[PDB]
Amino acid sequence: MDTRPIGFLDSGVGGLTVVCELIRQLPHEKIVYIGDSARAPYGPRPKKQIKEYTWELVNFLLTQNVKMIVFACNTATAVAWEEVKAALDIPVLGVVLPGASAAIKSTTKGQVGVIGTPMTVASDIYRKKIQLLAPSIQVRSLACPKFVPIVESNEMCSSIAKKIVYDSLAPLVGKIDTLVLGCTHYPLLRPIIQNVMGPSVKLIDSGAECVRDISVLLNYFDINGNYHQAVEHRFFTTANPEIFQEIASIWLKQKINVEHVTL
Amino acid sequence: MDTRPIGFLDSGVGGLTVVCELIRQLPHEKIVYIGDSARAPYGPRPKKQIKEYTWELVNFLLTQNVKMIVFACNTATAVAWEEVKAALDIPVLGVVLPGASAAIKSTTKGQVGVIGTPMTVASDIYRKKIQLLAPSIQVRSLACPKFVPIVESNEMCSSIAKKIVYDSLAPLVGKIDTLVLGCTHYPLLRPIIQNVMGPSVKLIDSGAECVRDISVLLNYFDINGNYHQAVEHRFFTTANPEIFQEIASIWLKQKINVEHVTL
Secondary structure: OOOOOOOEEOOOOOOOOOHHHHHHHOOOOEEEEEEEEOOOOOOOOHHHHHHHHHHHHHHHHHOOOOOOOEOOOOOHHHHHHHHHHHOOOOOOOEEEHHHHHHHHHHOOOEEEEEEHHHHHHHOOOOHHHHHOOOOOOEEEEEEOOOOOHHHHHHOOOHHHHHHHHHHHOOOOOOOOEEEEEEEOOHHHHHHHEEEEOOOEEEEEEEHHHHHHHHHHHHHHHHOOOOOOOOOOOEEEEEEOOHHHHHHHHHHHOOOOOEEEOOO | OOOOOOEEEEOOOOOOHHHHHHHHHOOOOOOOEEOOOOOOOOOOOOOHHHHHHHHHHHHHOOOOOOOOEEEEOOHHHHHOOHHHHHHOOOOOEEEEHOOOOOOOHHHOOEEEEEEEEHHHHHHHHHHOOOOOOOOOOOOEEEEEEOOOHHHOOOOOOOOHHHHHHHHHHHOOOOOOOOOOOOOHHHHHHHHHHHHHOOOOOOEEOHHHHHHHHHHHHHHOOOOOOOOOOOOOOOOOOOOOOHHHHHHHHOOOOOOEEEEOOOO
């Protein structure tokens, strides 16, 4: 079998929710994760510098002998994904495309909403992808900048959190049939988000969608790992490993060890 | 967008159930189908000759400018699929792999059953695929040679048909958690088959699984067609177009025109 691990690059701890999905869906696959906290916000950097940074993360992943690379950073995805994908021989994917495509396939009336980070909403990457494939679908994007913090502080059910989501999503209530959770933190607020949007709205989790694609892409490329096996993942971060495993150990429902590294 | 059609090759009218799934899932995609009835049974031919035949079907499909080829014939798949796939630049898939992979991912206790045509069961292609990936899973294959005829004569609900399925599946009742419908005719007997196997057994429809993979493979290769569009498919057969559209018009719930051709 192909015992090489599937690598994940991200400018943060967010991509770990996709890793959770992966562990959930494909237990037997090895994982290598690189989070570049030290450099922080990618969004407000210059394109040239973001490609520099991304390639650094990609090259690090290559020297982990990964058989596939997954982009978890929307900024890295916006700026580099297509270039790196064209340059590499191994499969290279992001969560945006699958999120967009799922939203398209799932919209009832063509009223698609997408919430996310300020930078994500500022790049309007999701709308661009959606309409690039299905330009007749109406995309309404909304930034929800309180969501990440809430999530990262474990608190998804506080009465304050419930209020925050309630107020942050108001501009969309009653205006859309499907809402793309364009941030990897957001899967953790799903109950609340579904609740605030009503049983009428279809929630699209990009990370979960991405994982589904992985499954098909491992089969197509004949690079599946040992199904009877992973019990050996590797996590890396360029900054603050303490709080990394802190959040990681919570999300991954198990103690995981991080390795502070410097590219 | 990529307006080229998705081609389907098969030694019969069976692959049309996959086309139905495709129309159902991806309405906007053009289809080109080639059925080689004139040559009939592929299974009991020699490998060399089956590769000859397959390539003929593939070359015909290429001169329809297809952006993807789908193998519906288990015999053609067993013998050629990997060779053609290696030779072509466009994506080339079959229904077997997706069927196998789905069964694996879906088996509760590792007791997988697979029914199908005598030739399919004789090649043991499904078991070989399943155990090649997950060799610890127990595969029990069973030939159900009355199934095709029943289906092809429109009769899926006769009290005779119900008996036939009942008796044909007996050897598996109570012995498996998931059953792969290793024949493209069989989707049409699903109600009856599910009924005979009990609510306890998980039915895997290779064709439906295959279609799902297509969706992911169109996105990965950036060759999706116009989402707002197909209303223009093309069906070909090397023998007896009369009964082709006959069955086709039934399955596809619409009148479709076939073009008798000679490779």
